[PDB]
């Protein structure tokens, strides 16, 4: 798995997408990566958010795991930074899927909230019922906990 992952990481580090910065593996574990996500959706565009990508031994035959380590106020990220990213679902996971697609899809998850299957139902309700109050809450939380935007 390490060999495939290093090839993937190497390609991503040389051709990074604009919304991913500082892509790097863990000191001695090439199966854990760290990166900053730079979302464009207001008010998330003000900061960046660190994520941890963990690759299983069986990769690419089992999906990677992704969580945020930076606190984020979002209906589709829980308070421990877990997400339900459809593309890496054990159900949807296909061994042809590359991590560049997975990160692109994560970028989508953050930029386009899905109020239909949220991890934080009260935030989804708020986002729908009073989007301005949601934006105020999210902005405050973003400015408080977000990582400085590269």
What domains sit in the chain, N to C, each tagged with a CATH number?
Answer: 1-150 (3.10.110.10)
Elucidation technique: X-ray
Question: Coil, strand or helix: which one is 111?
Answer: helix
R_g (Cα) of the chain, nearest Å = 16
Active site residue 84: yes
- Count the helices and strands in the chain (H runs, E runs): 4, 5
**Residues 6 or more apart from 91 whose CB is under 8 A from it?**
none
Contacts of 108 (CB under 8 A, 6+ apart): none
Sign of torsion, CA 75 78 81 85?
Answer: negative
The one catalytic residue among 30, 84, 87, 115? 84
| 125 cis-preceded (ω within 30 degrees of 0) | no
């Amino acid at each position: 798995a390490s060999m495939r992952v290093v090839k993937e990481l190497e390609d991503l580090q040389k051709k990074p997408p604009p919304y991913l910065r500082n892509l790097s593996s863990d000191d001695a574990n090439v199966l854990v990566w760290h990166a900053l996500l730079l979302p464009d959706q207001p008010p998330y565009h003000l900061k960046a958010f660190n994520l941890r990508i963990s690759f299983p031994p069986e990769y690419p035959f089992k999906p990677p795991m992704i969580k945020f380590t930076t606190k984020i106020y979002h209906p589709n990220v829980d308070e421990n930074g877990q997400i339900c990213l459809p593309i890496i679902s054990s159900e949807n996971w296909k061994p042809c899927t590359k991590t560049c697609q997975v990160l692109e899809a994560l970028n989508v998850l953050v930029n386009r909230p899905n109020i239909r299957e949220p991890l934080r139902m009260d935030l989804a309700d708020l986002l729908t019922q009073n989007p301005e109050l949601f934006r105020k809450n999210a902005e405050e939380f973003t400015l408080r906990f977000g990582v400085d935007r590269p």
